[PDB]
Scaffold this active site. Structure first.
Site: not given
Ligand SMILES: [Zn+2]
Ligand SMILES: [Zn+2]
Lengths: 263, 267
Positions: A1-2, A91, A109
């Site tokens: 995400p930006e 996750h 991640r």
DNA sequence: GCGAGAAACAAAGA
DNA sequence: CTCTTTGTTTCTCG
């Protein structure tokens, strides 16, 4: 995400969890709390979430009055609201429990981070990261932007992505912005003309503000419908009909028009 | 690379290139020759490499009589010997060609430098930088060392890294020395006891000589080192201190990653 | 003073 | 950039 995606997350959370008391904080991956999970548990348990701020891509939870939780999602972090009996997902790493539900942080991640910072250390924390200005006509000064560019031989895409010229651009919106400004991603900063820099300045703000307005890109945002180059390898540039190309720049996937953007 | 690694490189080259005449010097990155690539090409081409010395982390090629080539590898610079028809490699910048092969310089990050200096300007080159003594008993005088420390408020780790107290420590060996001497990296120089200073002085010499003996540290010519197996703190974050059992910690000190035992090294 | 940052640069790691 | 870190030195900032 930006930036736009983080801002969308900030708005949804603001609507839903402000006023809520944290009943418990639990973790299957405490190491992601860089400042120490047990400390964080001690200080935030029983406190009320008063607000959620953002600076760049960082989310800032105002919890109690003395501390702030600084959360970065990095590449894949995601928050969701679930019921108290919700089953774990693979996750999930962290959860904030409230009396009628819970806020779960998940990250495939494991790159995203939490940092417990005293309120007085928030401004310094961001000064110390050297994070650039918010992408608004109010904060993002073209003169300073121009001055820094003229002084550097850095390729423009990697330099933009450093977050020091301006905060909030990631791989997707940098490609969008360079396209909109007709600049090759490997153009050296100090070769940019004054007019080219002006357009770049405005395209940064215009694209990122538009994307906020559309709730970010989902690849429930709608900004993905307005992407002109990202993911369009081989398709026709809407402006000239050229085939959009994909190269690697400083290790990153990069989409551009070979006619509208020339080194 | 640090002093031991530069020394290991100096040895390997000394064994293999002294007596070789330079046929050609070519560059794909001439900008790293800070004094001017063309002048260098013109001055060294056709000359014999008579020797290679080292001062600190700097290599000194004696090629001909009037000029010396001063090479600094900075972070990642690497020399190798290849055949004449060897393929180029992505980060190769310079090569020195001989009748039977070539000496290639590579550097991923392009920090490494070459400088052409006239022979009688070599000693002034080093004096002008204020490089400290070599880390030998003969050169590294504990008395001067003490006086400099007693007079300074600098944190000991950045001060050691400056190369002025003594030449040749980098991030690895400075971490190793301070752990051996039981000194906190952030301790102000003037708070060091005479006995601490003595231990520090000796540990510098002892570690850098053991490192040279072991052919340097190979972390990631010169690359067959064994010293990486003898490291006690550098890159050991979260592992047990071998002296007290405590967890090795990592912090940032003057912008550099820094590994210490907080039990053994208290500020 | 000093320490902090930044420049030079590329790729790996988390 | 998602961001930080890396075997160095020289330089400007605050
Ligand atoms: Zn086009
Ligand atoms: Zn210990």
């Amino acid at each position: 995400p930006e930036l736009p995606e983080v801002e969308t997350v900030r708005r949804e959370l603001e609507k839903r969890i402000v006023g809520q008391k944290i009943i418990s904080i639990e973790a299957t991956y405490p190491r992601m709390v860089l400042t120490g999970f047990e400390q964080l548990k001690k200080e935030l348990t029983g406190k009320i979430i008063q607000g959620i701020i953002r600076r760049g891509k960082y989310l800032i939870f105002e919890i109690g009055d003395d501390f702030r939780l600084i959360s970065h999602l990095r590449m894949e972090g995601k928050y969701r609201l679930a019921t108290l009996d919700a089953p774990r997902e693979k996750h999930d790493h962290l959860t904030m429990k409230f009396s009628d539900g819970q806020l779960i942080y998940a990250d495939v991640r494991k790159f995203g981070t939490w940092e417990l910072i005293s309120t007085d250390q928030v401004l310094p924390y961001f000064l110390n990261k050297k994070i650039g200005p918010e992408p608004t006509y109010e904060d993002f000064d073209e003169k300073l932007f121009r001055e820094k560019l003229r002084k550097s031989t850095k390729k423009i895409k990697p330099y933009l992505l450093e977050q020091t010229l301006v905060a909030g651009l990631g791989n997707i919106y940098v490609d969008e912005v360079l396209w909109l400004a007709k600049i090759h991603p490997e153009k050296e900063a100090n070769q940019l003309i004054e007019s080219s820099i002006h357009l770049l300045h405005d395209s940064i703000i215009e694209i990122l503000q538009k994307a906020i307005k559309l709730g970010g890109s989902s690849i429930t945002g709608k900004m993905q419908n307005e992407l002109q180059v990202y993911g369009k390898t081989g398709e026709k540039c809407s402006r000239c009909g050229a085939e959009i190309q994909k190269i690697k720049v400083a290790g990153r996937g990069t989409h551009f028009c070979p006619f509208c953007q020339q080194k």
